[PDB]
Subunit: 338 residues, 4 copies
């Protein structure tokens, strides 16, 4: 059993824990979480884990003690008082193998190495990192991971959806250039009301309007697909929706492909080399049908449009549940190396 | 010389047209006057929905009622609303109505919309993409193509009044080879509040609980107002939990490789020149809340512009309710200037 | 040995009733089976609305179609939906339907609901307050008052199924002199997405853009299930931008002076004893998002309980879609046991 | 012109400034804002003031410089760098007479006295205070303010609505006791997603559910109406709405009155002693008709019900715009004593 410790038991931290529990019920997971770190007490963390506004209530019973939270008889050391850097957490004492860094403040590998120095064997950053050992999207460049990587980045949720769509289009037809627009759900980093913020777009009320923000999912596509480095760029549009997002990639193809050709190539890729990561839809679905869906990219074949050499591909993705299931699959791949 | 206007369908677009007409009269840039309104409800409900609005708030004028006419302020509008049959049953000729604004949504076909003309109307303006209409007009694009020989007039969609100025500037300055569109739109009344039956299984879902991808012909029928771009554009729509206010995201391949500053300066010159009042230039990090109750038909956001070689992505905001209705008022004044 | 059920109105309550039946069948506490569903749409839209739900997510079972029948998983439900007329036109006897769950909302009057009985149904359950019905039953309150001689059975409001357990515990333990309630309800399909015509000018406004205060007969008609409280209770409703999930706030004057701890202890004993399955006791800081997809009729929130002398305010949550539909499942199983 | 300095240019602060500008356009205002403090640069404050998600765009042009933000012909020194206590802000150097405390962290008069030490003549806290000189609700106990008060508070947004309703009910029929439930708009103190918070109820997603929270609006009614001290109590329920709230007071009356009697007493009070504070409405209005309404209490006569002596009175109020107009009117009343 791979011992995992979460740093930042927020939305992604609790989604990773719930996806790990669901994947253990499905049998495709072996790691267990033994520690969680956050800037709050165990009572608040246990209440936020039991009652979720988006994922509902947890089927297991959740209890507390004095420093640990008890779920299904299992116990997780709520080592949350560590308000300093990641090197202050006692991962070595708890025997934690893989650490899921999900605070949002330690995206730099120079800082993210504090987990490794504290006793951890490997670190998985749940966001685009800097100076990281490798940026992995499960199903795209997961084969490029040997045993010589410790600061591993699962990239962004948008990157985990754009990479499969761009991989199929480039490997089957070739990508000359593309511009994407991900229509994203609002996240905790936005303001509920009009208040100060480093981003004047996300400074506005998140639930009252649509805030166009930036993203590095397309500009950093070379981190997982080096042949597409500098060929993609785009931004994001935060809509009043809790979870569930969609990517709208408009790309010029090297070879002219029809709508039927692109849809047939995505259907064969979803049921083959990308089975479990990419899913093919021929049904008129909405984002409510994407909430709690573990797939990284949900290709919507109905919204495909092609003129001459320019093609628009639309693919859904759950920014919380789908990305956390990839963090579970990545923690299992790294745990297989430990 | 006041043009007499009659509204068929006093819904969201109908009341926004009356409010934009009243606001343009207070500004002095309007001469038409609405004299009649028809719906499928009594005059008390129409007067209440006009006074109290969830998006535009309360009306600054007092609103009263009688038995067959609704009185705003020093103004009387014959609430000829009992006419629930075809458009020919309405007494447009008896009431002396010059221009009829069709805003019900069920009379988009010019074959049925011709009943207004048979009923005594001089010109008919459909507030939606029509079929077999005399002309499809987008103010600021092909408004000059309207002479005196048109009676069944149409004003295209809310999305079209935003895409057309953006594609016109890009083609006149850099040339458009082909482009694809995704308009992020506010939800409209034709959507269901909860999951219920609907001809569109996408719009059948809860409008405020998710994003419904639906189809649109704004880009596919761009040749109706820009024949040089006919068949060069296509796209769809994505309804989001917002009452009013939408945005268009056009990714287009250009004939000539242009820079970000070139595209922004070209749109800025158009907004300050030939498209003053139709296109607006924004160099500030704005959001859709700033677009609510904005009379412009296309609000170009220069900060969201991106380009790769010749492929450019242009983002432009527009209020699908207020901005479109102000264009309907300007179109009614243009039609009144002919007859 | 399986009681055959047919749903008239496969809307929100209709699909929630079918999903609650399937979940109760997987738990083993249900024997009735739904064999027919009538709606104003084809079987394709019915299967799509059943498979994909905006609140309840996707169905774990696979859903297929044919030409007139929608196949769940192994089971087939005749989508007898062409019956767009009154409830007497549906062929319940030809389909062999024993109990009919009326959930269209347009056939709440017993003069219409009797059409199911004339069509071959043995018993009818209206998922709403009815007029001139045989009996109005709230499970856990007056469920004993049902003998074999009732056919026009009506389950009360979702608000009544939450207010009745509160008023029952308060009256049986402390006595109720008078009370005034205010239920904070989620928006429902009968409201408008934008400002449009409606019989209720309050519910005529945009449901998700504001809070619409509407009236309700939940508290005024409590005497139908507790005669000792007839006329002693009254209240209204306040629709808030929420898909599913509501809460009741009952301010009641008690006959005997009781403390906050005494009221919470009596409700905790009732939830753990006489009202196990209908009333739930919560000592955790819960919100309405913790109430969605909860089968309990009333979820008493002990933290929000307050009293001043003999005036007490009791707060209890309830899921107006899922929790109410489970009570329709239990009522259909009880009536099916009477056959 | 009364010199005013804002400490906390957030939602309430910018609502106070916009209400001051609108009241100056109406002609019934003389105060002028000269400073603003907000733990963010002048550029973010100028952008948040020009563009509002609820109040729309500002009709005046808004520009910036290096430390001051320009309205139109008016320049306001954005003294926002004062990140320490209120005693460190230079109110005396700028010549500010009255200071509007709107941060929410200096409600206690022990810390709020820093404004007076910094050179301010009077202090107006935009929230319930502790150890304050006097708690004033305009239209109720505003006459109890002489020149011998320096640290004044305007109570809560809910109190400014319950006080007129409780005053009319007590002066006409008498109040034995009452329990209220204010259905409130969500505010900045709530979380957008499920995250840690001092209040586990307000820790949940504010826009995805209703958060029941406590309030001292009814419990502290004795600060402005001593005869009702301890006779009123209630809580709050935050609903997914940006601005605009409503109070639902169920109160036992000393004399059994009818629905027509209570509605007639409220109509005469709104047309008499409470003209400008209480609004009477006979139309089926909703909260969208209450947004941006300067009244302190909008009595809805249609939602009134009675049985014996227990009556339920419903009154709307805009927690943002209406409360800020009461702050503007209070600043004009306090400035009249200088
Ligand atoms: N859908 C998504 O939200 C999503 C998707 C992909 C990636 N990510 C990335 O994952 C990370 C987490 O996202 P989220 O939405 O769950 O964020 P969140 O704000 O909901 O949770 C972040 C957590 O960090 C905690 N934290 C803050 N300071 C800390 C400290 N000093 N030590 C420990 N914990 C601390 C917070 O208290 C909170 O629990 C971010 O980097 C985000 O960009 C998020
Ligand atoms: N809503 C927008 O932003 C927008 C933008 C562009 C175009 N449009 C189009 O404009 C049209 C109207 O839009 P809306 O939002 O005002 O629609 P709506 O459904 O909100 O209002 C339509 C009105 O027509 C009335 N009506 C129904 N049947 C009628 C009949 N037989 N005779 C007369 N009146 C009748 C209805 O009662 C209602 O008042 C539609 O075609 C719509 O697609 C809407
Ligand atoms: N929504 C709730 O939470 C809730 C709770 C308790 C009771 N109810 C009651 O349920 C009924 C409405 O259910 P709902 O609001 O959940 O969903 P809904 O409005 O979708 O239910 C009605 C359904 O009946 C269908 N239908 C079938 N035959 C029909 C016919 N001949 N004419 C018209 N429609 C027909 C409609 O198409 C629709 O799908 C009302 O009686 C309401 O008071 C609803
Ligand atoms: N929100 C309402 O509707 C409402 C109504 C009545 C009273 N109030 C009360 O008014 C106060 C402010 O409410 P709000 O909604 O404007 O709050 P907010 O959090 O939205 O805004 C407060 C502002 O204070 C600024 N600020 C200045 N100095 C600060 C410092 N040292 N530390 C942190 N922030 C600092 C913040 O940057 C922010 O802009 C609170 O006491 C609140 O309870 C609010």
């Amino acid at each position: 059993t791979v011992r995992v410790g979460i740093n930042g038991f927020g939305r992604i931290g609790r989604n990773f824990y719930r996806a790990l529990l669901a994947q253990q019920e499905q049998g495709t997971a072996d790691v267990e979480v033994v520690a969680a770190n956050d800037i709050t007490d165990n009572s608040t963390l246990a209440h936020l884990l039991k009652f979720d506004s988006i994922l509902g209530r947890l089927p297991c019973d959740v209890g507390l003690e004095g420093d640990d939270t008890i779920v299904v008889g299992r116990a997780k050391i709520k080592a949350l008082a560590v308000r300093e850097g990641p090197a202050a957490l006692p991962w070595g004492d708890l025997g934690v193998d893989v650490v899921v860094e999900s605070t949002g403040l330690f995206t730099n590998a120079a800082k993210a190495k504090g987990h490794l120095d504290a006793g951890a064997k490997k670190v998985i950053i749940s966001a685009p990192a800097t100076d990281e050992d490798i940026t992995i999207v499960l199903g795209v460049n997961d084969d490029k991971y040997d045993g010589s990587q410790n600061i591993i980045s699962n990239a962004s949720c948008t990157t985990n959806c754009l990479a499969p769509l761009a991989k199929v289009l480039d490997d089957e037809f070739g990508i000359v250039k593309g511009l994407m627009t991900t229509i994203h759900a609002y996240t905790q980093d936005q303001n509920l009301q009009d208040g100060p913020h480093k981003d004047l777009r996300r400074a506005r009320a998140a639930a009252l309007n649509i805030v166009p923000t930036s993203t590095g999912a397309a500009k950093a596509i070379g981190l997982v697909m080096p042949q597409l480095k500098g060929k993609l760029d785009g931004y994001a549009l935060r809509v009043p929706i809790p979870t569930g997002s969609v990517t709208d990639l408009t790309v010029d193809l090297s070879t002219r492909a029809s709508v039927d050709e692109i849809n047939a190539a995505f259907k064969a890729a979803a049921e083959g080399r990308l089975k479990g990561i990419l899913k093919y839809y021929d049904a008129p679905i909405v984002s409510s049908d994407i909430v709690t869906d573990p797939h990284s990219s949900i290709f919507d074949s109905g919204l495909t449009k092609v003129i001459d050499d320019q093609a628009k591909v639309v693919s859904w993705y759950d920014n919380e549940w789908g990305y956390s299931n990839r963090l579970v699959d990545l923690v299992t791949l790294v745990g297989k190396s430990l």
